[model samples]
Target: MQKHWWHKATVYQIYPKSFMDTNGDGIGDLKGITSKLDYLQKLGVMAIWLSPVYDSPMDDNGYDIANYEAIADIFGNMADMDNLLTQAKMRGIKIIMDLVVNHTSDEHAWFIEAREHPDSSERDYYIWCDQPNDLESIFGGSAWQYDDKSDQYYLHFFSKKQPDLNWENANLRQKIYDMMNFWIDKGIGGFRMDVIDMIGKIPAQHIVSNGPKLHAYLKEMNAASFGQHDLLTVGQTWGATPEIAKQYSNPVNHELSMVFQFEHIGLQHKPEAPKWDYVKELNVPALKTIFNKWQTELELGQGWNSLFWNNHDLPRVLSIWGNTGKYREKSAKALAILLHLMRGTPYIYQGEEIGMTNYPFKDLNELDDIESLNYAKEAFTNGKSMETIMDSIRMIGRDNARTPMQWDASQNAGFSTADKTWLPVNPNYKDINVQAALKNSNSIFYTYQQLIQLRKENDWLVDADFELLPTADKVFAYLRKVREERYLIVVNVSDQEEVLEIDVDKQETLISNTNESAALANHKLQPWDAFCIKIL
Candidate 1:
């Protein structure tokens, strides 16, 4: 088997606007991110996956890119970006830029040209149609909107501001390829492709994503650009099954380094949540089955996994699954243990190390995400109360993960000195900030650092076979083995103690959430207790 550099990489995702503000513009910039290189270094991430920083009008929070070649004016210019890459390199941190080619903002030069002069060469640069009422966008509107002057409609899979590109055109494909090559030449580490699978849409058929030409387009993209860079690339693919994922990520396939699949993350939330709210649909057995299928099957099946519990688009994991209020620290470490020990690359979203929970937002004025607000508006039109919508989206909204990084207990949560910010800081920063966590040796932040260090020094973790260990109720157990070097990982996600089948050897325990020797007299794991032990 061949080894890949990315297999050992721990990725830290930064939602730039909320990371920190250096100039006190009430927003985080490239310099603000560069300022935190030391912090990321100490936290032990090998790569940083920054969300879209491209020039945009802030539609969909920069996902609707207007200029593929320029940085957003609000985020500073080319010089600041250059210093960011150079400084991160000094810290041994790779930067993964977001590639948002599925759609471009309507204000982009090409889209503006295509909208005007309907008979021009650029008219086919985007998908245009007439009275297409059947296509509904992911953003809850008809995918097509009529242009009175052009006497036609344009297709947008997301917001109307973001029009889908016409990939079937050879000229457009070549143009897209050139844009990718332009960045590789800029000395970027790689890309985190946004909605990449949607790029291969079938124009005549009006398919939303995963078109018949998906693999062909991916292969062509690789050949033209990133394959030569030998860089890490991941795709945000929502509909990918384990089977489809293999076709895209298998190194032999050369489409991408890995793809983000959302099956596990959506385990609790409803798809369009027309109901008041939803209950947890995930169980230990079901969760274990998903893990085993991906770890053993995907690992052995020649594909790789990009392990992540939260991202800019999802809610915080500790809030959803861990005991956020009662046993926050212990359960946070236990969940980290569960993810980091798996046979894959682990990604840590900003503020995750300190056991950040979803922000306690009681009103709409407290949230800033555009999509969440739109959802609220849609629900209200359907007769749901504002309180009912707030309570529900609060549990599953994207804004929960976009709250500013809790740097300190000070005013503005140490994110800015400005009187206001783009979004409100989680008020619990008084207890959960980085200043407090880094000072405590037994903090969740340090436990994460230890886990990443173990991945670096331990060979069995990467090379071993993944196995499910039979255990009693509420205890999730697994084993890692490379011939004879065996280890057992046991995690009790419950709020009560559970007895283990065998006694734990004090000398052989490698890591534990309690950060001390465990009393295994009855071989019991305390509430939310977690550990990895070398089998004697």
Candidate 2:
């Protein structure tokens, strides 16, 4: 595959609203991020993937973009954003803006124009149908919302407030490309293209199969708009097969540098139940198979993949993959090693380094995410008891990961000094804040920093070929190979002790979740322990 600057870079994802609040406005802003450039540099990350900070009403927590170029008033203005980019680069960190092009907020000027003049050219810029049924929003209810003024229904795969853009419209496509180029001209490195797969929806008709026209349009967009040198593109794609991904991310295609597939994150949701019903028990074997298959397939094919465990839209990784109650630390470190050592680019969500888990809420009113509200209503309509629904919401609500950044144990976790935060801080911030972690040598933050440093210092970790090692249940083992040198990685998922024999008599430990002196005789692993050893 062709080389890209992002291939070896580690990305840190920041949810702007909850990251850190400056000016004590009860919300995080670009200024807050500017103050943390030195902290990020010290952490050893190469780039930062900021969640949507563009102008919006924030129906979906900034996913609904009203103005692509202007920074949201909630965050800051364009000047603040410019300063952020400048300061971030000074610290050797590139910024990847969130590209939320699949849909636009109903309040966007384009949507407003379409609504006012249904027969005008702008009306065709969005997906508008006279009437449609059997189509439901990904969240709930009808995907089409009736606009009484125009006597037409607009399509929104997510929420009615977020109207889908008509990609089939050449003029609309060109306009989007122009907006993208405008950002690239501002010296922004690239984008974390949000819900990119949904951008190619069938025009007028919903749920159409992968048609020839989709690939043709994608290729044209690539060649004409995004395939420029020095620009990196990482697409957030769902329901994409390896073959389909190749058409977009193939090194030769020059469309996207890499793509994030949802197969791994989707493993946490129940297959047969509604999208809102989350499965707490993740299928480890299935997840491993999918990751291996995607890695190997991408390596063999022309495309590349982006690896991640958790993001703004999902629950904490430790809660999903490990025993959060007892083995939180071990499982968290193990998961970090698993994702970081993979063959693709790895992204660390904010607070992920310190092993943050999902927070519990007593009432639905405490939740802020639209998806969480919709799911709670759905459960209530289905006759689920209030207690049962609350439990489910606690387990899988989007609010789980939307809590404020735990900077210190001070008021509002030191995120802001406002009387009330826009969103509540994680309850455990008193113990899990970054200030505490920075002071402790054995904190998860230090461990994560070491992993990032190792990736930069050691080329094998980034370029090595990975192979799964033979292992029993609840243990994930893999080998990283670069030429004749090999490294063995072993992780224990259980809270109790477990053992496996090591093949090499002489091995040097590189890193471990626990202290170095922890016994490894008979390959015994402590609860949630992860170890990396160099074979000699």
Candidate 3:
């Protein structure tokens, strides 16, 4: 069977607010994105996954959508959005919008009417109850917020201002379906469904998502809108088990094309002890287990996976998974090679290609993440020491990834000519910016382009089966095998140089981080070394 276009394409995620701010507005808009269409084309990214541009109050930076059909004024009007789609398509690229249907802004008209008038037809659009429950809001405290006018608490898995939508309501579901189709008809390619798994809720039980009726709703969504066109759709599903993942991405099941499983990122996402109490170092053996399990399971399950290291909600991969201190470029390049050569579609977060890193924050005062603010407040109230709290914040704050894109070595990293940006640019941008790399032939930028083009020009990167080699320590390696052709991929994920043995008797080096590599001498690997070689 022929595969989907997305399976063979590379996805570039652009947080409009952080991409590039034109007009000196301090915030990136649709026009700014349009300006970069040709540059993105040269990077070889066939698809661009844009974060929300819908009308919003900026409560959660556009994820808390106020109007699904309209573009936010700060992001320019709907015409700018349509033009972005037009420009992207001209460059042979498809645009995938971020879909935020799991919840809506409290200020939305439906939520406003739903709270004010009990008899209103929109009253059931969101989950509401008379009494609050113990379910914890992802931000902090209880998940339910008491509505002063209605005297009822509405359920919100995230922040209180973003109330969970009631999927049980047929009218609401139909509206959502219509909204999805509306975008597809507008010439955009697909959607990256935000918190999609959390939509179906068992309200009587007051649960926080993964509702029993998820499949029925998803199938309905597909039948209504996405199925009509070959649009790329991937659900943002956090902490999903392989069995649960199968139901969404398996072609026969046909809910979504793939799912962004956070298991590998969490390392011990399914640890036996469950590291939910506090932050822990990344566990290598456990990380291996997570990837290997998903690879085998999803492959046999006939499902798909979304390979990523950084995104709007994630800290930079070079900052966490690989050492950004000593081997910044080397490790960054290695990680990129690892991500692209995987079994599924590879998503390149805006600045990850140039090895952009997390901002170094000395205290909470320097950060802009709402999650960090809420967490800091709760931690102080719960008696967590300031030292430990800041350390934890440094390890996992989403703002780290939300920082401005480092375009050049300019005063503002060339993201904007404005006096201040929406979020502070990483101080290291002077050294890591794109202008610096664009001139250097050995830079990570070129390596990314090479890897991306490799995937585009070859079928093996997307079609091959991934096998985790049970060899080497502090070194993660795998094999891409299809028919009689096999490719050995090896990378030293840690700082210290280490050698790992390979089983291939005959091989030729295809790509490497350092621009030079040969079949590992005596099966030895170098520090921050990553290379892919074909077995002959």
Please give each candidate's TM-score: 0.96, 0.95, 0.95
lDDT of each: 0.83, 0.79, 0.82
Writing each residue's lDDT as its tens digit, candidate 1 over 1-536 gives 67677777899999999998887778888898999999999988889998988889887888998998899978889899889999999999988888888779999989888877777777898888874757877777788878888888888878889888888877888888899898888788888988888877875576756888888998999999898777999988877887788998888997898888877765565566532365443466767777887877776547777788888987788878788777899999998998899887899999999999888889898787777787788889989899888987788888898888999988788998888888888878989899999999989999899999888778777789899877875788888989868888888877777777765454487789863345356567788889887875
**Given candidate 1, what's the lDDT at residue 41?**
95
Q: Give the local distance difference test score of model 2.
A: 0.79
How would you encode candidate 2's per-residue C-alpha lDDT over 245-315 as one tens digit per residue?
Answer: 78768877657877788877778878756545678766767776887777667653377777788889888
Clashing pairs for predicted structure model 3, backbone only: 499-525
- On the 0 to 100 scale, the lDDT of residue 118 in model 3 is 80
Clash numbers, per candidate = 0, 0, 1
What C-alpha lDDT, on a 0 to 100 scale, does residue 157 get in candidate 2? 82
How displaced is residue 130 in candidate 3, in Å?
1.4
